[PDB]
Amino acid sequence: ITFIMPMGVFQANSMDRYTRHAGDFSTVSEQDPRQFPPQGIFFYNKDGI
Amino acid sequence: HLNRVARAALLSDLKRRVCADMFFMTRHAREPRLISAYLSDMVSCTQPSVMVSRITHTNTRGRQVDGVLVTTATLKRQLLQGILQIDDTAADVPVTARVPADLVIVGDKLVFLEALERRVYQATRVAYPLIGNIDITFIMPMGVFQANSMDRYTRHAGDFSTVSEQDPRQFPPQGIFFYNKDGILTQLTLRDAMGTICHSSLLDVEATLVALRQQHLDRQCYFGVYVAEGTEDTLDVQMGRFMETWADMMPHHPHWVNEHLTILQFIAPSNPRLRFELNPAFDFFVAPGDVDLPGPQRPPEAMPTVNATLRIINGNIPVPLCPISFRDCRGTQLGLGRHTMTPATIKAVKDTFEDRAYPTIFYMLEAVIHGNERNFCALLRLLTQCIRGYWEQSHRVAFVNNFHMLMYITTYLGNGELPEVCINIYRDLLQHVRALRQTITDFTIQGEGHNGETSEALNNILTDDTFIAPILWDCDALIYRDEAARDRLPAIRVSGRNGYQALHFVDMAGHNFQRRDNVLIHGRPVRGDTGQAIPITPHHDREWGILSKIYYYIVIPAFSRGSCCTMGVRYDRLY
Amino acid sequence: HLNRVARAALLSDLKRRVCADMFFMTRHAREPRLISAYLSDMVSCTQPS
Amino acid sequence: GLIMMAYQAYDETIATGTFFYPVPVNPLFACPEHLASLRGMTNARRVLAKMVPPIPPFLGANHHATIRQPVAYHVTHSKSDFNTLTYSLLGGYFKFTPISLTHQLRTGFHPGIAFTVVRQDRFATEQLLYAERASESYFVGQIQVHHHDAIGGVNFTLTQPRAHVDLGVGYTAVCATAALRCPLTDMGNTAQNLFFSRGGVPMLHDNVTESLRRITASGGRLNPTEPLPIFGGLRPATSAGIARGQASVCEFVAMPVSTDLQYFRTACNPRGRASEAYPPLCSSDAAMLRTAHAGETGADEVHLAQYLIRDASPLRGCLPL
Amino acid sequence: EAYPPLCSSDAAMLRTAHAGETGADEVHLAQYLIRDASPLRGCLPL
């Protein structure tokens, strides 16, 4: 078996830059470090780490 | 013969299997399917034996059983109530017979289920086995910090919000919480740490130096681990031969420089300094072998050994181990209700430090006055005119570089001579210095003095008289330094000869710009007689050294951001 | 003769056991397993004669 | 000496370095641009001092000085504020002696050192065993008597010999640890003292050592006895019944505050490198621990800096709250 | 056809992707969570 596994695509449409709630991942900085395009992807190992 | 990689897969499989079902009977007690799954897997994992028999144990119908399962009556009733089913009550047993004994078919095999505790091990003095117990150890992190600003993310924005203007949530953690066996709230706090870290065993570093000295130590540069003596000069040619010595004596990049490495690059296996970090109170460095500190100006060649020194500042640990965000969060934790700078004085101070057209007349006046009260007591009008003219021409404050200048301004030129904006700036700056000293005072507990040292000196560094200011105008700080300690073995070196004489009130005839002995100009006393046989008195109180050190180590470097420089003057051309 | 510390463990065990099932018939009425568990524990806790 | 705040080089009204010569000795006041004021200035000194601060050897080495490279790097590379930067510099400026660290901890100040505590625990075990059918051949001998004279009468000793053979092809019988029942050992909080141990080097002042032992005596459940009985094991001071069973020690291991938190969220190593202690359910805030009963099935993982670690111990579905 | 597994482009969405408050986040600002489309759906516990 082989898997496809996306890495660095970007939410190009401004309509696609929507959240679940307004501050879900908020910080103490004036600029929220969430505006940035992704650079890394996450998944689980076979033991779940 | 599954070679090495499948043996490591087997390693991880045993790891997760031991972690998986060690107490499964009380773990998945509400899920009877998993209990039957584990038990049927247990029964059908043992290879059977030789099927030798003449007459065996069968049930009432005639099917032979395949073994016996032995436990205690608690687990007997626990499996019997809802997990496994009863096959029969009586059984057939040889006599070298119908006997009431329960039996359960599990999976494909039929087994006796025994809990033999009533008939034997009851009312006798032999302890029943299978109650062996365990020895488990728990790991429990205490005071780590989310170093990355990536990691300071919430679930929802104001989850744990408050009524204060600052949410008490920026701070690094200091305590951990868990549950007792009764489910009550339990607490570990860093106050519990004296049983490990506050012992004398923290300084048992000698044997590790002896063991580490037995390794292959290579020749590295002798810049940051080597101390020289003064060569009794005018301090110009000294930085001269220091310049053409330092210009080529490094054969590579010094190891204590690269603080720009992150966490992972520092703890990477390729780091040669990773093996040189043993103790949090110690820095380990390659040192000359059998060379006394301080050694001579020309470094003697020797087989390089290893030496270690104490980390007095807790920030002396590398910033890969102590992040800038953590330190800023800690400073935010300190500065909740303390004094701060209003935007007017802070923009004036940053504008007058980031001014590059700063006149040197202020430098000339600070050099000639040289922090003497007798000099400032006769120059009220000139200083008033100079400060006013520099202020209301570019809105930049002056004479704030020198610490022996601005409290003079507040005390004498503070009745309303200067414009009111400048006096409020100076008052705010002295208020911030006093607030920093108060912050030091409130975080130490008084009343305990050991070896003649006050608790202010024992806790903090800027309140210890052993540590001195970077620039001394008066010799009072040296007097407090070699008088307050009395157990710290002192050694003062002023350009060759050891010690000072502190001869003040120098005049026209004997100014002696080319003086090479240890006469140091302490300064003319104002409310007293200079004399010659009079012993040297301090100009100010013990709090003078504290306030000066606090100023030079807080206000100047944080506002200048490591851009200002310290330098010596040339009085032989300045005067 | 479990000395004092295990007697205090027994103390806390009696505390949590009295707090645990005083009115268990009407407490875990919707959970038939706990009723059978308590009844089976109770019936097999006394010695016969 | 003197300090000038900003370096100028294109001010041609005054000759360069005719009043001052740069003599910088502080990591904080490192001045790579001010070095042109000294005579004999070249490109080599500037390109070599742009990375390494110029400090004279006769005025203190960087390793031998109080102010070192990391505090200078912190003050030169921090961009948050000026009040916060000054208070951060103040919080850096503290001694790291045992007296000092005692002061900051009993004050409430947080030093830049992270920790773990290790806790050895014991539990009652029920064991589950299935053996086999034809696992043992069990020979019996013949009974033999022995009459032996005694104090008042005679003693009969009855002896019967016997032998067992495991006629299994391989592993026939398997036992497995099954149940927990009552935990005999306490999951509370008792700190492990090192002041019991002797053999390390003492420090110079005995009154300071006695004061440290006195401070360590306060704030704990088990402490060394006040008469300090020599020639013995130094048993801890007694009390009445510990409220729910025998307490377990908590020994501290120090780490930097910059540590991977996700490493501890699984079964990890107490040393920090495998070559396994199971962490329990835990949180560093009172809010998240009381939240951790799965309120809205609430898995509050981390809020800002305090953290919650989900349970990696084998006691996952046990010990009700 | 290669079956894509459960994957997230932020550490937050993966560590909350165990259905915390039965929490199915799809995108917060620009990073994304993709639900598992492999046949190994109800297997491989976390």
Q: What is the 3-state secondary structure (H, E, C) of B344-369?
A: HHHHHHHHHHCCCCCCCHHHHHHHHH
Strand partners, D129: B70, D175
What is the number of other CB atoms lying within 10 angstroms of the CB of residue B30?
Answer: 10
Q: Determine the Cα–Cα distance for residues D244 and C15; give it in Å rounded to an integer.
A: 10
Asked if omega into B294 is within 30° of 0 (cis), the reply is: yes
Count of CB pairs separated by less than 8 Å, C with D: 30
Residue D220 token pair: 């704990």
Touching E: B residues 149-168, CB under 8 Å: 150, 153, 155
Chain E hits for A31, CB-CB cut-off 8 Å, are none
Indicate which of E1, E6, E7 best probes the interface with A, i.e. most A CBs within 10 Å of its own CB: E7
Q: Given phi > 0 = left and psi -120 to 50 = alpha, else beta, which region is E11?
A: alpha
Helix (H, G, I), strand (E, B) or coil at B111: strand
Q: Determine the Cα–Cα distance for residues D117 and B255; give it in Å rounded to an integer.
A: 33
Distance from the Cα of B177 to chain D's closest Cα (Å) equals 5
Q: Determine the Cα–Cα distance for residues B142 and B135; give it in Å rounded to an integer.
A: 22
Distance from the Cα of D297 to chain E's closest Cα (Å) equals 5
What is the number of other CB atoms lying within 10 angstroms of the CB of residue D183?
Answer: 18
**Secondary element (H or E) of residue B307:** strand B305-310
Contacts of B157 (CB under 8 A, 6+ apart): A21, A22, A23, A24, A26
Residue E39 token pair: 């046949």
Of D296, D297, D301, the CB nearest to E15: D301
Q: Determine the Cα–Cα distance for residues D215 and B519; give it in Å rounded to an integer.
A: 47
> Is-contact D165 D136, C-beta < 8 A?
yes
Q: Determine the Cα–Cα distance for residues B275 and B215; give it in Å rounded to an integer.
A: 12
Q: What is the DSSP letter of B201?
A: G
Helix (H, G, I), strand (E, B) or coil at D288: helix
At B353, which amino acid appears? F
Q: DSSP string spanning D12-60?
A: -SS-TTSSEEE----STT--SSGGGGSSS--HHHHHHHTTS----GGG-
Chain D hits for C9, CB-CB cut-off 8 Å, are 184, 241-242, 244-246
Torsion on CA atoms E35, E41, E42, E46, rounded to nearest 10: -60
E44 interfacial to chain B (CB closer than 8 Å): no
Q: Determine the Cα–Cα distance for residues B276 and B283; give it in Å rounded to an integer.
A: 8
Chain E hits for B153, CB-CB cut-off 8 Å, are 12
3+ Cβ–Cβ pairs closer than 8 Å linking E and C: no
Residue C21 token pair: 């099932």
Q: Is B81's CB within 8 Å of C37's CB?
A: yes
E46 interfacial to chain D (CB closer than 8 Å): no
Contacts of B490 (CB under 8 A, 6+ apart): B481, B482
Closest by CA to D230, choosing from D198, D193, D192, is D198
Q: Count CA atoms closer than 13 A to D158's CA, side-chain side.
A: 2
Closest by CA to B60, choosing from B97, B85, B96, is B97
Chain B hits for C44, CB-CB cut-off 8 Å, are 73, 77
Helix (H, G, I), strand (E, B) or coil at C38: helix
Strand partners, B98: B92
CA distances (Å), A38 to each of A9, A13, A14, A19, A34, in order? 7, 15, 15, 15, 9
Closest by CA to D66, choosing from E30, B2, B464, B246, is B464
Q: Determine the Cα–Cα distance for residues B571 and D20; give it in Å rounded to an integer.
A: 9
> Is-contact B364 B574, C-beta < 8 A?
yes
Q: Given phi > 0 = left and psi -120 to 50 = alpha, else beta, which region is B67?
A: left
Q: Is D297's CB within 8 Å of E20's CB?
A: yes
Chain centroid to CA B255: how far?
20
Which residue bears the tokens 């000339």? B364
Q: Is E25's CB within 8 Å of A25's CB?
A: no
Strand partners, B104: B111
Distance from the Cα of C21 to chain B's closest Cα (Å) equals 15
Q: Is B152's CB within 8 Å of A47's CB?
A: no
What is the number of other CB atoms lying within 10 angstroms of the CB of residue B479?
Answer: 18
3+ Cβ–Cβ pairs closer than 8 Å linking E and D: yes
Q: Is C36's CB within 8 Å of B73's CB?
A: no
Helices (H) and strands (E) in chain A, counts: 0, 0
Neighbours of A, requiring at least 3 CB pairs below 8 Å, are B, E
Touching E: A residues 3-42, CB under 8 Å: 3-6, 9-11, 16-20, 24-25, 32, 34-38, 40-42
Residue D145 token pair: 């008597």
Torsion on CA atoms D219, D225, D226, D228, rounded to nearest 10: -140
> Is-contact D202 B203, C-beta < 8 A?
no
Q: What helix, strand, coil percent values describe chain E, rounded to 5? A: 10, 15, 75
Contacts of D289 (CB under 8 A, 6+ apart): B177, B178, B179, B185, D282, D283, D308
Distance from the Cα of B533 to chain D's closest Cα (Å) equals 28
Strand partners, C36: none
**Residues B244, B249, B253, B257, CA torsion sign:** negative
Q: Which residue of D has its CA nearest to E13?
A: D301
Contacts of B92 (CB under 8 A, 6+ apart): B57, B58, B59, B60, B62, B98, B99
Helix (H, G, I), strand (E, B) or coil at B406: helix
Chain D hits for E21, CB-CB cut-off 8 Å, are 296-299
Pair type for strands D282-283 and D308-309:
antiparallel
Closest by CA to B170, choosing from D154, D87, D272, is D87
Q: Determine the Cα–Cα distance for residues B229 and B447; give it in Å rounded to an integer.
A: 40
A11 interfacial to chain B (CB closer than 8 Å): no
Residue D162 token pair: 């016997």
Q: Count CA atoms closer than 13 A to D108's CA, side-chain side.
A: 6
Q: Is E15's CB within 8 Å of D296's CB?
A: no
Helices (H) and strands (E) in chain C, counts: 3, 0
Which residue bears the tokens 């099935």? D297
Pair type for strands B68-70 and B109-114:
parallel
What is the number of other CB atoms lying within 10 angstroms of the CB of residue D291?
Answer: 20
Q: DSSP string spanning B235-301?
A: SSHHHHHHHHHHTT--SS--TT--TT--HHHHSSTT-TTGGG---TTEEEEEE-TT-PSS--SSPPP
Q: Which residue of E has its CA nearest to D292?
A: E20
D275 interfacial to chain E (CB closer than 8 Å): no
Strands (E), D228-290: 251-256, 282-283
Q: Determine the Cα–Cα distance for residues B32 and B16; give it in Å rounded to an integer.
A: 22
Q: Determine the Cα–Cα distance for residues D187 and D23; give it in Å rounded to an integer.
A: 60
Q: Is D244's CB within 8 Å of C9's CB?
A: yes
Neighbours of C, requiring at least 3 CB pairs below 8 Å, are B, D
At B358, which amino acid appears? Y
Residue D276 token pair: 């396994």
Chain C hits for B81, CB-CB cut-off 8 Å, are 33, 36-37, 40
> Is-contact D289 B185, C-beta < 8 A?
yes
Closest by CA to B340, choosing from B443, B435, B438, is B435
3+ Cβ–Cβ pairs closer than 8 Å linking A and C: no
Chain E hits for B147, CB-CB cut-off 8 Å, are none
CA distances (Å), B463 to each of B460, B469, B492, B541, B551, in order? 6, 11, 20, 13, 12
Residue B113 token pair: 């289920």
Distance from the Cα of A48 to chain B's closest Cα (Å) equals 11
Chain C hits for D241, CB-CB cut-off 8 Å, are 4-5, 7-9, 11
Distance from the Cα of B186 to chain A's closest Cα (Å) equals 28
**What angle (nearest 5°) sits at the alpha carbon of residue D285, between those of residues D280 and D290?**
70
